[PDB]
Amino acid sequence: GKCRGLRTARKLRSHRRDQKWHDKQYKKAHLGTALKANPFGGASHAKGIVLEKVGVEAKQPNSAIRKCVRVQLIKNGKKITAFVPNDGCLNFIEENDEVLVAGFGRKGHAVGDIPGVRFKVVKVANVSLLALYKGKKERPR
């Protein structure tokens, strides 16, 4: 059992903070390795330059091509794969453009049947992908 003495507070707190390192959430947010390994560096979004347009295969029970773009972040110069989350927004994407990529939804974890993709594109050429999809505003042609 656990100690219950009147002057065992030091043992209780020392044991607590030693055991707090054994759950992933505390280890992740207090070690710093996850922060360094994060391509975004603790940022909600990141701008980048479209390096290529690539297609990713779905998982086993699905069968589709997920239209993603390989992007290099303007800060730290890291190369990541960002999903394009609409039906025909890849055509809205061309080569060498600024794209505001954001996390896909669950904190650096792969989402759905897309393997290894944890980011999605939000804006391209400083105009929203939703606005282009809905026709609210057109490309800066």
Add this chain to the structure above:
Amino acid sequence: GRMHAPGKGLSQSALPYRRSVPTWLKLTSDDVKEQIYKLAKKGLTPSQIGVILRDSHGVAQVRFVTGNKILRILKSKGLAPDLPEDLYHLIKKAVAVRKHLERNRKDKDAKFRLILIESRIHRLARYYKTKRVLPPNWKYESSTASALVA
């Protein structure tokens, strides 16, 4: 349970509720004292004095008849041993095991019991230091104990 053994024996002496001296006992307080003085000069430990008095002279408790304990009686006269009786016997057992152990090096069991005995020696010695029975610098040396006891 036992300090250095897995054992939970309840074998203990049970003192009577009657603190009064039995009316048949005819030895008075001084008579117990001089019997105690005699047997102590003979070279008997206080525990050995109590058993002989109980088994032969019919005193169930020395403290009940004299009002004072056996070791207190010896120290008051001044013939109590310097080493406490229980501490003396622990060193005696430790020396005997040491003597046996040097003849029989392969007795890993005898070595194990030796550590248990010397652990009890140090724990008892700490208590006696705290009560100031023993000198504050009294150490149990494995080498010099063979002459300290026996």
Add this chain to the structure above:
Amino acid sequence: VRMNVLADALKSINNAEKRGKRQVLIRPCSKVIVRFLTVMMKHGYIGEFEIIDDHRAGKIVVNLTGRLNKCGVISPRFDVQLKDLEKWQNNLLPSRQFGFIVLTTSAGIMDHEEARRKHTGGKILGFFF
């Protein structure tokens, strides 16, 4: 070894009450035990108890009335002030209507209602309801 004599007496009468025994014998008696048994009697939770006097720590036989539910102990005797007493009340007592928290104060051993009546905190001992 035995370290909390009160904790052992409370557990013994709790187990005996669960089984349904008319009487229970708690082996090591002490002053705190007698006072703790006294407050239970004055609130009617237990019947007569008799302290058997041997020259050692005596024994106690308690007549269980069967109207007890739990008589636990709070082993680390926390210091309870008058401002955190209600936080102990709702944490331990089943309800605000019945149930008693017994704490040792400088005015003696008594329940929380009376301790508050004479405006004094103290050290938590146990509870019963």
Add this chain to the structure above:
RNA sequence: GGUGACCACGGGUGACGGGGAAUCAGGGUUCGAUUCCGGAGAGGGAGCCUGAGAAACGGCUACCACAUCCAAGGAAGGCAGCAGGCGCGCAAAUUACCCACUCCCGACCCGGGGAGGUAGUGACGAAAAAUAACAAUACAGGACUCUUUCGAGGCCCUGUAAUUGGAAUGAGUCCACUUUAAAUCCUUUAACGAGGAUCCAUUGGAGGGCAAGUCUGGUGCCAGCAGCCGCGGUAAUUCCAGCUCCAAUAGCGUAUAUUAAAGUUGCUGCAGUUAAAAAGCUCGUAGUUGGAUCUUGGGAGCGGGCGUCCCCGCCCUCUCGGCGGGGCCCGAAGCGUUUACUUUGAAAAAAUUAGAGUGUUCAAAGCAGGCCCGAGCCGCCUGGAUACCGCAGCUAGGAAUAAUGGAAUAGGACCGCGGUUCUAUUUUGUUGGUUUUCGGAACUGAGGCCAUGAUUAAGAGGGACGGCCGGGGGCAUUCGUAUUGCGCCGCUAGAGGUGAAAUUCUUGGACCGGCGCAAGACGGACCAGAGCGAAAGCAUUUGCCAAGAAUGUUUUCAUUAAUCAAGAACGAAAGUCGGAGGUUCGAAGACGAUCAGAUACCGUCGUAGUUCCGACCAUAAACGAUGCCGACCGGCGAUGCGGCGGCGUUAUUCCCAUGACCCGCCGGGCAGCUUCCGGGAAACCAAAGUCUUUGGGUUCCGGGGGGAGUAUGGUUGCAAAGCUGAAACUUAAAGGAAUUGACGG
């Protein structure tokens, strides 16, 4: 010398500290660059002048890094001030007006203030609140009513489409006023200003979680959707649209940090047999935790009414008691321990929080405000509370719990009496001589008194003693058959081995039978849900050596105790080193078989090893997959040891013991059966119970599955390896117990 496991020192911080912010049962977890207080800095360091005050930078000097002008001889720099640019970025405003307010500076009613105020940008965020209301017609609905369905109206509410159909209004234009330093905005208030009142609400969804379609048209495992389950391969409730519904609403969606949910960090309050998990075992220092016991009972009218309730009052001492000599009194000194604890009081910035008052037109706010004016009201009444403020420090009451002490070689308390050395004042008032035991302080001798002074001996522990008990340990010794080999003797052609064979041994006598010899192992049957040991483990006889549990105890000591980081002892088997020995078996290896192949299972050999001594290694499914100490909570029959009782049988003897049985009791073990103790997911467990009715003490240790007991560092080892021990990345399950079915060489 000083500081350290009560964590020193060192390292990191995406650390300025605090008041405070978010979340909100309680406890907590995060956040505080940011307007108030304190600190620090002015590109990085360093050094100085002046001054009361600076190591000042809208002061100077120097160096470093940048950087400006130059006639190239020199000279001049510091926006982490207000604006405003570049860069960096996911990310953040006008190179505006004014000292009118609040205050600051100055020689000062007069000047100055990018402090600060005002305006501009401003969906950071917060408060209020439009996008419509009503009436009469049609058609349903209502407990409708009138005849008892039928039909109507003496009523009510919704809905669809209409020359309805004339009432109310702002949002907009815009006059003036007001506001203000000057404006703006707001509030006032003119004239306009609503029938798709087109003066047009959006953002996300409609399989489930989760409110809303099993509509229609496209696409056809494609496009795509989908936080998770999942949808789509031609009849999509899920994609792309239309229609229609749903949610919130001037706001809604997404990403990320953080809180609750999370009793998935568990102090409150989690777990550890099988799910992840208790160290192989014991000792042990720090740490944590520790049996019982020292004043209770009796009083007074008051008194929760002696109204036996009980406001309650309780029926420490010595010193001037300040109302050298009064009882008419209450002030000076110490505590006949020291703390923890609890209550009270003091002091604890404001702002923020809770909260008192106050109709801001309500609210967020703010600290304002209210009464009358008949016009003299030549002015009256207020508020600007209070609470909390952790821990530490200060103060006064209480003394229950907890710690700590007093008298044990009395070097003890208290009353005095001796004998000893100094000394403020003395007055044996002219000074000087002074007596000053004078007053108290110096040390010491002899007394009385103290009820003279030691709580008890834990169903706590240690130790002693008694008779036993045990495959407990070490050394020596003895015996057993078997196995292998060898020597003779006999008779024989086979023997061995396998599912079947074969490798192999054999007319030299193999196998078999007999008598011997030698060696090295191993201690059968007895042998058990029996014993002992800390575990590992321990089984031929005998002797020696120490050790031990339990029991017995009217012995002794008297709390000496429990668990324990660090450290230490012991640890099957295999493995390593050195020396002996090597019968059997047998990793490696060889061969014969089997097989589709057969690096194997089977067979014949056979090395290391297996045996002993010495030294390492420290691991096992080291298992009960189950920490230790302590208490409580059913029954029953046995078993081992010790003790205590008893009808009898038996051994001898002439009787008791004493052994062997028989029937019980007690204590301590190994277990078993049983039970609706209770627990548990259940299997099951008298513990794995006494757990939301959660707290006996204390160790170790788990936090979805993998990566991984891996990499690296450290350390131990001759080596093999041991101990300590991540991350990146990946994944929606992996698992546990039970049910049904299927299947089983």
Add this chain to the structure above:
RNA sequence: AGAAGACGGUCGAACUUGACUAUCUAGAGGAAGUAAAAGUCGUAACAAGGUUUCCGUAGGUGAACCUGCGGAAGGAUCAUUA
């Protein structure tokens, strides 16, 4: 009264060198872990999985794995008779 200047002292920037310590990162080659291919080879584990399985240790083998020694039942026996 006194300026330039000089010896010495003291704070001491800065430069050169060396050391230590932090992160980041290249690297021939080597050796792992993950995900998808009804790819190849066998069949080690599950039933007595066709040699019960598993643990520790050691050697061996294309691969799973095999074998020796000790252990466990989480076994395929809670049981086998005087």
